[PDB]
Write a protein that binds this ligand. Structure first.
Ligand SMILES: [Mg+2]
Ligand SMILES: [Mg+2]
Ligand SMILES: [Mg+2]
Ligand SMILES: [Mg+2]
Ligand SMILES: [Mg+2]
Ligand SMILES: [Mg+2]
Ligand SMILES: [Mg+2]
Ligand SMILES: [Mg+2]
Ligand SMILES: [Mg+2]
Ligand SMILES: [Zn+2]
Lengths: 94, 37, 148, 120, 94, 67, 50, 49, 177, 86
RNA sequence: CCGAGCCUGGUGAUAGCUGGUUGUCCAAGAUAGAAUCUUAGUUCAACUUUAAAUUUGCCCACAGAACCCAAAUCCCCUUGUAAAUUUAACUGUUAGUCCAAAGAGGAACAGCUCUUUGGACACUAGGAAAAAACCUUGUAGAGAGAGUAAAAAAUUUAACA
């Protein structure tokens, strides 16, 4: 007795989940935070034409720095010291 | 399943929470309008 | 694994912290090979900073064997008699130095799981808790529902 | 079907009592939005998650500064439900070069330029 | 010595007799032992608390399985308190 | 102490107390094992760590009359 | 109906929450919901709903 | 630490419980009148900068 | 402290004999508290490995009262083991047969479902009437208070309370009553 | 617990975030000497300086854009003046 | 052990078919479709990976994009950010399930089937009872520290002159 048809959370007939005041409080909190977010999003500080052409310089320097870092790709340097330090394994006290 | 159904199609939990929070909160005075007034 | 491995309660040797602190690493015995690319690290360590090690730590004693070995070893025993064998085979000098320094810092007691990260021989003040601490008494000591 | 939701601009039109309660003066408005991520980027569309990635808020509970300008407010509107925002407060003026190091934030959205680390 | 207390190092006999001897050396009356609290008296695990009171004033309380164990433990407590070797005493200075 | 105590808001004054503690030993912690395993996917990996640990002993505590 | 939707003390109404999209609820919702705000579910109609 | 304190020195934990009860009473007085009153003495807070 | 080690341990982990009276109390609350004390949660030294339980005894289970129409609503059900042995008895008849079974099974449900449940149920004690064997009305410690109050009856309300209580309305004289 | 109260009072919801419980030094030499800064505090402070420099640059760029708009509007004014003078 | 014997050789017969496939550690990584004696497969495209050259790449601001007879979309300077294209070399995936939404078929049935936008799963963790697909939540460790997230169903019913 007490069986559910098929799976418990899907299909034409499922186990009916219900709401709790815990979830109600949680969601009202989320949405009131979102309402104050709307408020603070309002009243901008500058206009489109005011803010049009100020950051293009910084964006340009950023993109050219990225280009330089990407172009800077080569093999590393090789050195006689790094090569010949492999000879140091056969040392022994005389 | 389909949108319109013969039975009441059980809805998503988020939606059911939203509908359970959104109701007509009747504006009542602190005093009942019969005994005092 | 904790249940497979033994355990101990945290403790110090002889209560070293109260009195004068003493470096309770007693002895080191290095076994190195003249030949062998594996013993190059030990040889260069003995060259540079084993002298400085002994001079920094006069209390400890150091023996060097310098005998043919396919693998260089370091043996160290502590005040308790705790033995510690370690293999420095194919090991760099800076990490060998850190190893020796940590052995000098380490005490004479084998490393295993510690049940408790502290130890207080005088834990309880104001009297240990018993069930009758936080409840009152009765007039001339009467149990509930008792005439005399 | 599910699509990018257009927001009517009338939503972002403050009322007199809204001003009175939030203490946000429309005249002489703030300049900078402190932002923090409250919601999971999972179970969210690719545009929302990659937009917050572009803004640079992969890490939660991390106050990050953006401008108060329409181009950014667009993305902020798009991912508004995922974030707690608040404008920047400072009584002590901009941080001087001498006080670059003794800076500290507050839960009230304020930025103290000096941090003496002891009570009044 | 810091760890173990007195009577693990220095065993004694007739602690209550030694206690009355000490109290009469200090010129006070011979106190009486009185059970303050008890539980499970008929139970297989009797538990008693004995207090040593002089002139209607207490000096030491002691738990015990039985009355004798409780009173001798209270005598030991009084001895520790008198000699000043209470576990809550000033640690050794360095 | 046995009959009193002093609370901070949050912490007490510096010169009011003086808590001296000595370091006694530094060691590698006993080897702690961490492995991740998944089912029917040949995903198995093991790793062993030896976290460093230090031991202190508190020598003495004293109180100043400065209230 | 009109006086109830005028005099409801709830500061939160389906039209507001939907036109705002304050929790991505347009996911669970339909575009028809914008005009079928709360009263409708498929063919049904709850007049008490607001 | 609250646990081991209540274990080994119950007098201090009883002091803490009395402190908490008094703070509850101060909070109730504040719930009655938030301002327009002298704030609780223990409810007073420290300002750091 | 300045106590000895073994006596200190003994007094710390010792057992306690709690008593309660079941005169007009709810078995729900009574079993909740009895479970707390049997587990020994009230001891701040509680951990599952040490059986820090305490003996509990309750009196006058016969004079127990539920909240609601539970005397009829509730159904204590048990299967004997044979076919058709699926017996059910309402709380009323189950009480008439055995007045303690209600409270003991209530605590049986309250307590954890580990094998310690049976041991703690053994430690529990039970009496439908205000009478006790000598040993276990002797070896007691303390009688903690009851969860709820008992409302007074008209014969119990003194006269001065009635006089202090103001009368609310004036009846007309012409009325049979 | 109490994080909301700490926030309404002005402190961090988590005491480990900021304040005297976490920013102060955790140890000092018995002789009274100052201990070296720990890596957590060092990285937090570096992050704070980066944050502050970012705030400064952002505000400077916003003010520069506003000033550039003002200059461009003045240009437009003076060039209309030129036009009707022609 | 005869739908046509047993033995040997070709013969290690072939098999898109089943099964199996050995030491340690790390990183990136399921992704439109077309043709096929083709749908248990394969080839190409796409996706994924690797190493390099180059520069624009994602979000996008006004404006712009049909007569017939709705949610959104395309392009798109700025701004926010750092990726994208091309080149050289292959492999593998290419029989997919639920949910929300727009539709069709069906019975306005299916844990049904088929397309589209999106999400999750086939990767870890907490919760709804156990629970793939529901809600929170992702970059990995030691802790005998702390603050939060989603997170517990409420209902009792009809007198009448
Ligand atoms: Mg099933
Ligand atoms: Mg659908
Ligand atoms: Mg044949
Ligand atoms: Mg073959
Ligand atoms: Mg095939
Ligand atoms: Mg990976
Ligand atoms: Mg573009
Ligand atoms: Mg299907
Ligand atoms: Mg199906
Ligand atoms: Zn009335």
């Amino acid at each position: 007795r007490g069986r559910i048809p098929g799976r418990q959370w899907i299909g034409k007939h499922r186990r009916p989940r219900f709401v709790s005041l815990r979830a109600k409080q949680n969601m009202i909190r989320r949405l009131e935070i979102e309402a104050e977010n709307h408020y603070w999003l309002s009243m901008p500080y500058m206009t489109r034409e005011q803010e049009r052409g100020h950051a293009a310089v910084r964006r340009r320097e950023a993109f050219e720095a990225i280009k330089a870092a990407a172009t800077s790709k080569f093999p590393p340097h090789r050195f006689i010291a790094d090569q010949l330090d492999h000879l140091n394994v056969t040392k022994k006290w005389s | 399943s389909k949108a319109v159904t013969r039975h009441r199609r059980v809805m998503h939990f988020q939606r059911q929470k939203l509908m359970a929070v959104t109701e007509y909160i009747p504006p009542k005075p602190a005093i009942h309008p019969s005994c005092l007034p | 694994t904790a249940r497979g491995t033994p355990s101990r309660f945290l403790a110090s040797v002889l209560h070293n912290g109260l009195g004068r602190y003493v470096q309770q690493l007693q002895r080191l015995s290095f076994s190195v090979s003249r030949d062998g690319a594996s013993s190059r690290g030990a040889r260069e360590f003995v060259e540079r900073e084993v002298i400085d090690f002994a001079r920094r730590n006069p209390g400890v004693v150091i023996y060097v064997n310098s005998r043919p070995c396919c693998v260089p070893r370091v043996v160290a025993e502590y005040l308790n008699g705790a033995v510690r064998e370690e293999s420095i085979h194919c090991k760099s000098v800076e990490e060998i130095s850190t190893l020796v320094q940590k052995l000098a810092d380490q005490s004479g007691l084998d490393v295993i799981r510690i049940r408790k990260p502290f130890h207080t021989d005088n834990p309880s003040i104001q009297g240990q808790w018993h069930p009758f601490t936080n409840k009152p008494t009765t007039f001339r000591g009467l149990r509930p529902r008792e005439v005399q | 079907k599910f699509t990018r939701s257009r927001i009517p601009e009338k939503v972002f039109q403050a009322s007199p009592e809204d001003h009175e309660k939030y203490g946000g003066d429309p005249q002489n408005p703030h300049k900078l939005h402190i932002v923090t991520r409250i919601k999971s980027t999972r179970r969210r569309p690719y545009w929302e998650k990659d937009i917050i990635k572009m803004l640079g808020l992969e890490k939660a509970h991390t106050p990050q500064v953006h401008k108060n300008i329409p181009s950014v407010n667009a993305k902020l509107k798009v991912v508004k439900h995922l974030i707690r925002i608040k404008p920047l407060k400072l009584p002590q003026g901009l941080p001087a070069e001498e006080n670059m190091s003794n800076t500290c934030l507050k839960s009230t959205g304020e930025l103290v330029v000096q941090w003496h680390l002891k009570p009044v | 010595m810091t760890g173990k207390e007195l009577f693990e190092m220095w065993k004694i006999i007739n602690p209550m007799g030694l206690l009355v001897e000490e109290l009469k050396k200090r010129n006070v009356s011979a106190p009486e032992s009185r059970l303050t609290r008890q539980s499970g008296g008929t139970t297989a695990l009797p538990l008693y608390f004995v207090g040593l009171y002089c002139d209607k004033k207490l000096i030491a309380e002691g738990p015990g399985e039985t009355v004798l164990v409780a009173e001798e433990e209270a005598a030991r407590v009084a001895l520790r308190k008198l000699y000043g070797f209470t576990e809550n005493r000033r640690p050794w200075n360095y | 102490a046995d009959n009193f105590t002093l609370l901070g808001k949050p912490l007490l004054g510096k010169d009011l107390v003086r808590v001296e503690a000595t370091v006694i030993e530094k060691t590698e912690s006993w080897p702690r094992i961490i492995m991740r395993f998944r089912k029917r996917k040949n995903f198995k990996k093991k790793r062993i760590v030896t976290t460093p640990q230090t031991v202190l002993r508190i020598n003495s505590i004293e109180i100043a009359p400065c209230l | 109906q009109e006086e109830r939707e005028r005099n409801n003390q709830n500061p939160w109404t389906f039209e507001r929450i939907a036109t705002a999209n304050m929790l991505g609820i347009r996911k669970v919702l339909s575009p028809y919901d914008l005009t079928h705000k709360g009263k409708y579910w498929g063919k049904f109609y709850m007049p008490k709903r607001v | 630490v609250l646990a081991d304190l209540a274990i080994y020195e119950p007098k201090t934990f009883k002091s803490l419980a009395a402190l908490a009860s008094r703070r509850r009473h101060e909070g109730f007085a504040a719930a009655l009148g938030d301002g327009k009153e002298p704030e609780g003495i223990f409810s007073r807070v420290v300002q750091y900068h | 402290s300045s106590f000895s080690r073994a006596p200190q341990q003994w007094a710390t982990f010792a057992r306690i004999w709690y008593l309660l009276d079941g005169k007009m109390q709810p078995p729900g609350k009574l079993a909740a508290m009895a479970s707390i004390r049997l587990q020994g949660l009230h001891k701040p030294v509680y951990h599952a490995l040490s059986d820090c339980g305490d003996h509990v005894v309750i009196m006058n289970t016969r004079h127990i009262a539920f909240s609601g129409n539970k005397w009829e609503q509730k159904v204590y059900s048990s299967h004997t083991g044979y076919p058709g042995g699926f017996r059910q008895v309402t709380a009323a008849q189950l009480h008439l047969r055995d007045p303690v079974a209600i409270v003991k099974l209530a605590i049986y449900g309250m307590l954890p479902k580990n094998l310690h449940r049976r041991t703690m149920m053994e430690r529990l004690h039970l009496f439908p009437d205000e009478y006790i064997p000598e040993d276990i009305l002797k070896n007691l410690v303390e009688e903690l208070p009851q969860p709820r109050k008992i409302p007074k009856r008209l014969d119990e309300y003194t006269q001065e309370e009635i006089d202090a209580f103001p009368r609310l309305w004036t009846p007309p004289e012409d009325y049979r009553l | 617990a109490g994080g909301q109260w700490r926030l309404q009072q002005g402190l961090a919801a988590n005491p480990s975030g900021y304040g005297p419980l976490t920013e102060l030094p955790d140890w000092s030499y018995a002789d009274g000497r100052p201990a070296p800064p720990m890596k957590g505090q060092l990285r937090r402070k570096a992050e704070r300086e980066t944050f502050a420099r970012r705030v400064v640059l952002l505000s400077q760029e916003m003010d520069a854009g506003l000033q550039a708009w003002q200059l461009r509007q003045q240009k437009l004014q003076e060039e209309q003046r030129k036009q009707e003078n022609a």
